[PDB]
Design a protein around this ligand. Structure first.
Ligand SMILES: [Cl-]
Ligand SMILES: [Mg+2]
Ligand SMILES: [Mg+2]
Ligand code: NA
Ligand code: NA
Length: 106
């Protein structure tokens, strides 16, 4: 399951409270590659739930989060562990996304 997060307060609560790796898909409704990778992100979320929390944030609906985390193109995947950013992938390359999850959630 990919969790839809619709406000900064809940976003920050998830990041500061999670023990698992958190992977965030920052996307937009007008973004073409976002639509391509969305079903793949859903599959990953079903394959790796024990070790990873999967979140999606619509940058135009939660702009304060998009601004705070310095988003400049969509989709961008940010990876957090213990409240701190440990990696990021800009764009919708499926191979690199899966590998980055495997790297940070062995
Ligand atoms: Cl790590
Ligand atoms: Mg859905
Ligand atoms: Mg929109
Ligand atoms: Na959690
Ligand atoms: Na999840």
């Amino acid at each position: 399951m990919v969790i839809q997060v619709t406000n900064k307060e809940e976003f920050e609560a998830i990041l500061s409270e999670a023990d698992k790796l958190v992977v965030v898909d920052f996307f937009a409704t007008w973004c073409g590659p976002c639509k391509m990778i969305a079903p793949f992100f859903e599959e990953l979320s079903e394959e790796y739930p024990d070790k990873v929390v999967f979140i999606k944030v619509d940058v135009d609906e939660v702009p304060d989060v998009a601004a705070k985390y310095g988003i400049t193109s969509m989709p961008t995947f940010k990876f957090f562990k213990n409240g701190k950013k440990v990696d990021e992938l800009v764009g919708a390359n499926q191979e690199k996304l899966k590998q980055m999850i495997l790297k940070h959630a062995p």
